Structure formats: C-alpha cells, structure tokens
Amino acid sequence: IVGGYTCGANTVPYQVSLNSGYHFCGGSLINSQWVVSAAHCYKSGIQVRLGEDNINVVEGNEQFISASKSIVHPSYNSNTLNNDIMLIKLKSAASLNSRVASISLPTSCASAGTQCLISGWGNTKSSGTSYPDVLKCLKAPILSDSSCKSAYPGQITSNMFCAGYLEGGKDSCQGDSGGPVVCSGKLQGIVSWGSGCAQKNKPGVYTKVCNYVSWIKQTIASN
C-alpha cells in the first residue's frame, strides 16, 4: 500500500497473508474454512496465516493453517487477468474470534463513489521499494466505469473496477495482490493489477467480487 496508514494490530480481522516460505499475497477469510484471493496468486505449498499484524514476528494471535486445496476460477485468463479470483480451503477450520473473523460476501455490487478499505503488506513506495512488516490500510473510493476505462483503454472488463485516486499518491502495490477491498462491511474487491503504483491516472484495478458470489457459494457447498 502506497500513501496509506498503519492499520493497527488485528483491526482488519479477515485479512490473511499467504505464505510459501515468505509472504507473497493477501487474501480474505470468508468462513472458518475458506479464503478468497486473486487467481494470479495461485501456487502450490500455500500456508494461510491468519491473525497477523507483523508478518516477521510471532505476536500471539496468529493461526497458521496449510491449504488443502486451491480452486482457480474456471474462466481465469492470466494474460488479461479477467476473472482474477481463486478460492483456498484450509486443512482445518480457523478458530474465529474478534481478531480472526470472516468478511461478508456482497448481496449487491457497490457503486462508484462508495468508500472502501484496502489493506495489505505490499510495497509502500511508488518509485523505490520498501516492504512493511505491519499491515497497511488505505481508504479509497470506487471510481466510475467510464473513468476506469479511460485510464486503461482496452483493458477493463465487466469483472473489474478501479478504486483510488486519479491524482495518484495513494494506491495498492506489489505484494498487496489478492487482498481485500471492503466497503460497508462487504468484500467488494480483490487486489488484482495496476500500471506501477500510485501513478497519476493509473489507479489500482480490482476483481469485481459481486459477480462471483454464486460461484463462491456453490463451490464452497461442494468442496
């Protein structure tokens, strides 16, 4: 997250870190056994880390649970990033509490102008490179489809939306991939892609989660 703030320990209780020897992506806990992330975060050997603040220090509220299976969306295209969503099942159910909690799926799509919370352990620099140990947060509005498409000609599908600031300065970045965009207590987005970070007229692009609620529910119900 570039131009954000330190969230505070365990203040975003649905935020997970995906770890394969090191943090490589964010995710969102949606029930005791399932995490939603980006399809471009797919790899084998995933351990889900819940209750994290400082990802380099064991602080006492963590749960480390190996993934038993991952399910990339059937229509995910890695070239265009259309349908950039994946589900990860935990080998055992997380113990849910005030600091490890699921986030509700949307029942309807959120509108341009809706204020959301974006979070992650990604790069905090737009030019250089600096990775935080503690979770960073950004409050950002959803941008209109027209402004999103104008920012990225030929690249925005019906499964994507822009959030952030056309002036730049505040954005998601490398390492935030797969993490949450939460608006009014609902998971509306997944950190998907952008052109650099916090650049003028290049806001972050997010997977439009409301399009996938039926797929998420039916997949969970049979796996």
Residues placed in the known binding site for substrate: 171-172, 174-175, 177
Does the annotation count 66 as an active-site position? no
Residue span binding Ca ion (CB under 5 A) among the ranges 58-66, 84-92, 120-128, 213-221: 58-66
Q: Using only the alpha carbons of the chain, give its radius of gyration.
A: 16
Exactly one of 28, 37, 70, 177 is catalytic; which is it? 177
Q: Please say which residue, 134 or 166, places its beta carbon nearer to Ca ion.
A: 134
At 96, the amino acid letter reads L
Question: For residue 214, with 0-12 CB atoms within 10 Å meaning exposed, 13-18 middle and 19 or more buried, which class applies?
Answer: exposed
3-class secondary structure, 29? strand
Task: Name every residue whose Cβ is closer than 8 Å to that of residue 204 and which is 6 or more positions away in sequence.
Answer: 118, 140, 162, 163, 164, 171, 172, 191, 192, 193, 194, 197
Does the annotation count 73 as an active-site position? no
Does the annotation count 40 as an active-site position? yes
Residues 139-168 that bind Ca ion (CB under 5 A): none
182 token code pair: 């939460």
Residue span binding Ca ion (CB under 5 A) among the ranges 27-35, 47-55, 89-97, 131-139: 47-55
Exactly one of 84, 102, 176, 192 is catalytic; which is it? 84
List binding-site positions for Ca(2+): 52, 54, 57, 62
Q: Which residues are catalytic?
A: 40, 84, 177
Interacting residues with Ca ion (CB under 5 A): 52, 54, 59
